[PDB]
Design a protein around this ligand. Structure first.
Ligand SMILES: NC(=O)c1ccc[n+]([C@@H]2O[C@H](COP(=O)([O-])OP(=O)(O)OC[C@H]3O[C@@H](n4cnc5c(N)ncnc54)[C@H](OP(=O)(O)O)[C@@H]3O)[C@@H](O)[C@H]2O)c1
Ligand SMILES: NC(=O)c1ccc[n+]([C@@H]2O[C@H](COP(=O)([O-])OP(=O)(O)OC[C@H]3O[C@@H](n4cnc5c(N)ncnc54)[C@H](OP(=O)(O)O)[C@@H]3O)[C@@H](O)[C@H]2O)c1
Ligand SMILES: O=S(=O)(O)CCNC(CO)(CO)CO
Ligand SMILES: O=S(=O)(O)CCNC(CO)(CO)CO
Ligand SMILES: O=S(=O)(O)CCNC(CO)(CO)CO
Ligand SMILES: O=S(=O)(O)CCNC(CO)(CO)CO
Lengths: 327, 327
């Protein structure tokens, strides 16, 4: 019998999970749950689409609910809510609110007897695992995380909110020289501005002042003002034609030393044609883990830091020892 | 108070654990245990050196015993033995014997109520984790493991065994073109010979026939005969001067596709000035986990596949969430 998945929320991650389900034959997609009217949400798989108010009624039909909503306001509501009734996975990524989100989800899950794995994906998620591994294997050393080259939806939206901007796509770009210094084992001290450049392609509204748009981008707090930021004005057709993907990636590197001075470097990197597709593929592996954990009577909120890799696999622990441990 | 470590066996890994202890202030080295007479084993840290027959008597003095012996014959004896009395970590790496070793250590540990983690290091160990992560995140795709550039003690000893060879060092060398094809997402089908070259530096005995030495290297089953192998005859001084390190490294790469055809690539790589120092640093992180597990009443044999990354850290679960999960 297959592990029964539901999707909560049908954006990029929602479409991603749907696709990842096709690559995971031990799972089946029971339903997509949306806050929009189901009649207006066309899903690729033609499973049933339902409104979030019907989810509660599906409590015995679903093993794991993958929460695909945005971190800023969707998940703070939906994580604690769905964890009252289901085992859940989400991708929550707001640094400052992680202890608060964890607490709120854990209350709910503890209370219902369900497993909630929060903050799964590539960062947080895989990059987090590699930050941790780095510093426990090489306690004397330095960790560096680089993101990109890729599209940042958050920075793209920040530019779009500008009056006089009709649409935009921003790329986060690791600065090569900084990355090279890190990889060489120089253990550079690097500022914000020395690690990433920001590149912005922007479609002006009619009647906009480009100098003012450019200034508002470059002086924007929290998004652009600590970065060397470049702004290009282009047509809407060009933006569509050349800047429609959601590629991304990055590197986590630990450069350390043995106690006798040997230079040791660990590097974990990603090169993704689609960031949401990758993130969702990870969500689905983690759903397998949450299910195993629930079947064994576990409950409460977890992070990637709590989950042993063996639970992620449809293979038995014995076949894993045999096939992957060595050689 | 400090986690009490003992070392069983004082070779390269033994010296590595001793060094790694100095970078782990929550641990202390209680004793080195050797099969040699302790009077003949000079240890760097001047902790006490004891013979393995005194170990049993240290059962209440030691939290974890890191087993630093060789995999071919030392560990098959010492793993099951020490697991009768202590929580253990070892680096066992013999592919075909892993299920048997696991069974034998697990019987012993289950019996004593101790936690044994087998097959910890970089391969097996970290590379294994990354092979597994690869295929669960990207079920549709290909995994490739490359080793080197670095010294293989096994292949070096295999050469050294040849009559007419005084000493030797062998380098395992990933073939750049094969690696570039893998990175490109071409998903090449690669034979053994396509993946790695082997390079041999050899010191001839007096009166040797070099043609015969070279033939015996290049036609050696299991070590050389599926690889393009190069053999250089050099002096003993040159071997000592230029070939004394134990550098190593490698790459595990998963090249996969989303269900919509997006190319996704994960890569984990190591660049190690000292392979044994690195391996032992990992052993010590895993010792921390074995101890946590034992404190919670767990028992039996584990692999890296059973251990969540959070147990590796001296930080609390809360501080990990806060500090490493994002940003
Ligand atoms: N951890 C990681 O590595 C990682 C990586 C990538 C993303 N993420 C996180 O995942 C979150 C979700 O990303 P996303 O790209 O899926 O966001 P998204 O496309 O904006 O989707 C978010 C939510 O918005 C709603 N929505 C989607 N399309 C809509 C439309 N056309 N009109 C109205 N509402 C719509 C959906 O809810 P309803 O169906 O209910 O409307 C959906 O759940 C991000 O906020 C980010 O924090 C994490
Ligand atoms: N998982 C991984 O990634 C990984 C990486 C590297 C190595 N390893 C494994 O670890 C194993 C140990 O490697 P190692 O480099 O520590 O091997 P080693 O130097 O040969 O030491 C192995 C054992 O030999 C004995 N020994 C050491 N020096 C000696 C000497 N001068 N004379 C006589 N006996 C001596 C020691 O036992 P006594 O003190 O009792 O004599 C020691 O425990 C390897 O076989 C390999 O399988 C695993
Ligand atoms: O999916 S969410 O709508 O964000 C949470 C569930 N919705 C309700 C109504 O707000 C929570 O009370 C009931 O389904
Ligand atoms: O590109 S940046 O946004 O500056 C950094 C990475 N952020 C993401 C958010 O999901 C992954 O952590 C991708 O944009
Ligand atoms: O370190 S080992 O010696 O390989 C295992 C323990 N020793 C004995 C073998 O003489 C087990 O019988 C006795 O302590
Ligand atoms: O270099 S090779 O030996 O061909 C392959 C890797 N082996 C080691 C054995 O510890 C790591 O797996 C290092 O040589």
């Amino acid at each position: 019998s297959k592990i029964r998945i539901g999707i909560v929320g049908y954006g990029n991650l929602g479409r991603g999970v749907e696709a990842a389900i096709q690559q995971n034959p031990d799972m089946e997609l029971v339903a997509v749950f949306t806050r929009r009217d189901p009649k207006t949400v066309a899903v690729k798989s033609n499973v049933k689409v339902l409104h979030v108010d019907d989810a509660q009624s599906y409590k015995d039909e679903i093993d794991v609910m993958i929460l695909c909503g945005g971190s800023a306001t969707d998940l703070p509501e939906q994580g604690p809510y769905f964890a009252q009734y289901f085992n859940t996975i989400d991708s929550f990524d707001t640094h400052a609110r992680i202890p608060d989100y964890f607490d709120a989800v854990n209350a709910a899950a503890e209370q219902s007897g369900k497993v909630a794995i929060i903050s799964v994906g590539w960062d947080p998620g895989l990059f987090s695992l590699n930050r941790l591994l780095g510093e426990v294997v090489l306690p004397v050393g330095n960790t560096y995380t680089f993101w990109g080259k890729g599209v940042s939806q958050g920075h793209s939206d920040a530019i779009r909110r500008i009056q006089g901007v009709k649409n935009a796509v921003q790329y986060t770009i690791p600065i090569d020289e900084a990355v090279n210094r890190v990889r060489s084992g120089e253990n550079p001290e690097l500022s914000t501005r020395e690690k990433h450049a920001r590149e912005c392609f922007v479609v002006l509204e009619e009647g906009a002042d480009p100098a003012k748009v450019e200034h508002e981008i470059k002086t924007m707090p929290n998004y652009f003002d600590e970065y060397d930021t470049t702004v290009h004005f282009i047509s809407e057709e060009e933006l569509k034609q050349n800047h429609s993907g959601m590629p991304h990636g990055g590197f986590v590197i630990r450069s350390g030393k043995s106690d006798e001075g040997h230079k040791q470097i660990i590097e974990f990197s990603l090169n993704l044609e689609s960031n949401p597709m990758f993130t969702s593929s990870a969500l689905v592996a983690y759903a397998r883990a949450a299910y195993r954990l629930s079947q064994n009577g576990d409950k409460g909120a977890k992070t990637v830091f709590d989950i042993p890799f063996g639970l992620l696999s449809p293979k038995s622990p014995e076949d894993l020892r045999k096939e992957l441990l060595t050689r």
